[PDB]
Structure 1
Amino acid sequence: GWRAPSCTKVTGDGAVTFTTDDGATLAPTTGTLQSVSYTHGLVALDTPNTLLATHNDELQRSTDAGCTWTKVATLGSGSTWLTAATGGRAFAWEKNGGYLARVDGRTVTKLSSPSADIVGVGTDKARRDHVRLAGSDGQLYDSTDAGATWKPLGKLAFGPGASVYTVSFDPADLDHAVAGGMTTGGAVTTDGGATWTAATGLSATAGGKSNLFAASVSPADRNVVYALGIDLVEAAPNSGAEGRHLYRSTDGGRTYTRIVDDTPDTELTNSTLLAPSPVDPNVLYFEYGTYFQAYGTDLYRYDARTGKVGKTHNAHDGISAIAFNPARPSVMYLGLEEVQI
């Protein structure tokens, strides 16, 4: 049922638009985005032509593949991420906060998160009531009643006393997850947290420490993981080297290789958004944007076939979220930021 958008202009408040050319042009929106705005929540659902977004605390829905956006509800948090689930369902959650809710069509059920500091959420494609969640100590939690109740699952990803930035769940297999921590680098599980294996390759120095700020298992190939981190040995004081790179694993998160470096031409931060292509395992989108000096936003496209990074530029202050049209993934939905300087 899914189709490409049958429009060139979007009817909505300006928080969500789309591009058909990797950001070279953005569809005009009827509304003008107002400061202060972030759009951290944006997903395509399995339901044909249906998307959800959260613009600040406003949950929005489109049922015509992004041509029209309408308010559904106001959520109890002003900064939520979305994770799609089977059957017109999604989970809304505050990254590094405690807010957690379930969306069923347009109905919102606020849940009791088992963690006050959520760093990842994953859903079971085969079992729509099955959902997992990670806390910032590296503990995974499991629910089989659509998030109504929760049990701890498995062991801590890096053992006790660790600070975990992120857990990315393989969309094809919730038993497969990657964790990124402070000084502890990366870890990977394939048995739902029963055992964890430390990743290598995030430092150019054997056994070197690193921060793994963000990770994303490719929906295109369970063996491909994209990551953002700092090699703490490379970032030795007085070196003046930041040590910040993007990385790629091709063995499911066991070993990583540097693929992009933090430069003015490929600008990285500790918060760079990672958007792997859902169909091409070679392709990673990422972005940089700032309102300062009205610099605008760079939308980057990495392709592992050559290792090269292309970029387009637009005038918005940032892109907070990216989703892909399932029928034509070259159509990309962009959730936008506007901050008044």
Structure 2
Amino acid sequence: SGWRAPSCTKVTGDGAVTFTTDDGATLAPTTGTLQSVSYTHGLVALDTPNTLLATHNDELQRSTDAGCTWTKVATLGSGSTWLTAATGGRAFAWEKNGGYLARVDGRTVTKLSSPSADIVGVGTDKARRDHVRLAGSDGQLYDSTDAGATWKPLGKLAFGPGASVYTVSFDPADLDHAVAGGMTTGGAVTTDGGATWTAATGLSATAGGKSNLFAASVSPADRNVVYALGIDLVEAAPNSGAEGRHLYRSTDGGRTYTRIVDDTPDTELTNSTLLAPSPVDPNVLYFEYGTYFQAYGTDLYRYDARTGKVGKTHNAHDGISAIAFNPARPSVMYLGLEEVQI
């Protein structure tokens, strides 16, 4: 049998992962209660039917009934890891801006030796389950053909030497398509695996203005659609009174961006706002804002490019640290949660 919607109303798990069928208006109860301090940065649905992986702090967790039950698989070397799925029951765990890198083959954890001590992105080739790619914070891509066993540098630096690169986001349909984001250097895009990079425009409303690109996510449903989080540093000039933060959308694969969301009390943005594009609708982006502060809780936002408006739901958790979608019923969203109050 293939992927199915969860066959439960309550989740057997420690509380780090739940699901919603209504865009976050209601969250499935969990048997366990999430404890401070907890982050769930890693959460992916695998191609293996009804199988997901999550990292709750340094606990690697697995579900094989589409999220109804979560069980501990192993303890990872890092307590802060993100997950990238690969074809054939495989995933890579990695610490963002850290050095830890490991492979998950089913239930087997293999520590890898990263070619970078400051990892800012990982991508997998869906047509070749051994072809994995990694980016370092200087903007160097590294390529591997042996499931991460060994590595070699690939292409040129996204922004040239001396850059501080926040992220490299790989197109899930094509490892050779990547978007990089840097400090004052804005965005870049490659369609050839890092051999040539083109500087993006549109992150600043001023021609040639500097910008930051903190995070980007290529739509799993359209290689031409890229969502991004960044700052217009001209708008955020000293003494301006504006932090210049926006969400952006590209329809040419990362060459040019347009502002789609502004940082306001109605749509609150930070330099680490989670981006979760819909895997089936290139018009739709989910994002979050949450804080422990004053017990505000968490907003789960939904942007729709058809109209350009943002809706939201609210829950009481300190934050949503990761999002994945059920491939058989993508209206079912898996949420990895944070609890951080002292």
Establish whether residue 78 from structure 1 lines up as the match of residue 79 from structure 2.
yes
Runs (5+) with no aligned partner, structure 1: none
For residue 237 of structure 1, report the CA deviation from its aligned partner.
Answer: 1.1
Question: How many Å separate the matches in 2 of 1:290 and 1:313?
Answer: 12
Question: How many Å separate the matches in 2 of 1:186 and 1:60?
Answer: 34
Match of 1:201 in 2: 202
Match of 1:212, SS? strand
C-alpha distance after superposition, 1:166-201 (max 9, x if no partner): 000000000000000000000000000000000000
Establish whether residue 36 from structure 1 lines up as the match of residue 52 from structure 2.
no
Question: How many Å separate the matches in 2 of 1:238 and 1:75?
Answer: 45
Question: How many Å separate the matches in 1 of 2:131 and 2:25?
Answer: 39
Question: How many Å separate the matches in 2 of 1:25 and 1:339?
Answer: 21
C-alpha distance after superposition, 1:241-284 (max 9, x if no partner): 11000000000000000000000110000000000000000000
Match of 2:174 in 1: 173
Match of 2:115, SS? coil
Question: How many Å separate the matches in 2 of 1:227 and 1:339?
Answer: 26
Question: How many Å separate the matches in 1 of 2:217 and 2:85?
Answer: 15
Aligned residues: 341
Question: How many Å separate the matches in 2 of 1:36 and 1:104?
Answer: 28
Any residues of structure 2 matched to 1:55-74 within 5 Å, and which? 55-74=56-75
Question: How many Å separate the matches in 2 of 1:237 and 1:161?
Answer: 24
Question: How many Å separate the matches in 1 of 2:195 and 2:168?
Answer: 15
Establish whether residue 159 from structure 1 lines up as the match of residue 164 from structure 2.
no
C-alpha distance after superposition, 1:269-306 (max 9, x if no partner): 00000000000000000000001111100000000000
Match of 1:133, SS? strand
Question: How many Å separate the matches in 2 of 1:107 and 1:48?
Answer: 17
For residue 238 of structure 1, report the CA deviation from its aligned partner.
Answer: 1.2
For residue 340 of structure 1, report the CA deviation from its aligned partner.
Answer: 2.2
Match of 1:103, SS? strand
Question: How many Å separate the matches in 1 of 2:244 and 2:266?
Answer: 16
For residue 69 of structure 1, report the CA deviation from its aligned partner.
Answer: 0.3
C-alpha distance after superposition, 1:102-149 (max 9, x if no partner): 000111000000000000000000100110000000000000000000
C-alpha distance after superposition, 1:205-234 (max 9, x if no partner): 000000000001110100000000000000
Question: How many Å separate the matches in 1 of 2:312 and 2:69?
Answer: 27
Question: How many Å separate the matches in 2 of 1:205 and 1:229?
Answer: 14
For residue 14 of structure 1, report the CA deviation from its aligned partner.
Answer: 0.2
Match of 2:294, SS? helix
Match of 1:10, SS? coil
Any residues of structure 2 matched to 1:167-316 within 5 Å, and which? 167-316=168-317
Question: How many Å separate the matches in 1 of 2:137 and 2:238?
Answer: 27
Establish whether residue 2 from structure 1 lines up as the match of residue 28 from structure 2.
no
C-alpha distance after superposition, 1:35-74 (max 9, x if no partner): 0000000000000000000000000000000000000000
Q: List, as ranges, runs of 4+ consecutive aligned residues in structure 1 with deviation greater than 3 Å.
A: none
Question: How many Å separate the matches in 1 of 2:240 and 2:102?
Answer: 45
For residue 13 of structure 1, report the CA deviation from its aligned partner.
Answer: 0.3
Match of 2:188, SS? strand
Question: How many Å separate the matches in 1 of 2:90 and 2:319?
Answer: 27
Match of 1:293, SS? helix
Question: How many Å separate the matches in 1 of 2:232 and 2:205?
Answer: 7
Question: How many Å separate the matches in 1 of 2:275 and 2:116?
Answer: 24
Question: How many Å separate the matches in 2 of 1:191 and 1:134?
Answer: 15
- Alignment TM-score, normalising by the size of structure 2: 0.99
Match of 2:111 in 1: 110
Question: How many Å separate the matches in 1 of 2:288 and 2:58?
Answer: 23
**Aligned Cα RMSD in Å?**
0.4
Question: How many Å separate the matches in 2 of 1:237 and 1:264?
Answer: 22
Question: How many Å separate the matches in 1 of 2:185 and 2:243?
Answer: 18
Establish whether residue 47 from structure 1 lines up as the match of residue 60 from structure 2.
no
Question: How many Å separate the matches in 1 of 2:331 and 2:269?
Answer: 24
Question: How many Å separate the matches in 2 of 1:90 and 1:178?
Answer: 21
Question: How many Å separate the matches in 2 of 1:336 and 1:164?
Answer: 27
Question: How many Å separate the matches in 2 of 1:53 and 1:74?
Answer: 12
C-alpha distance after superposition, 1:143-170 (max 9, x if no partner): 0000000000000000000000000000
Question: How many Å separate the matches in 2 of 1:50 and 1:58?
Answer: 17
Question: How many Å separate the matches in 1 of 2:340 and 2:197?
Answer: 40
For residue 239 of structure 1, report the CA deviation from its aligned partner.
Answer: 1.2
Question: How many Å separate the matches in 2 of 1:53 and 1:124?
Answer: 21
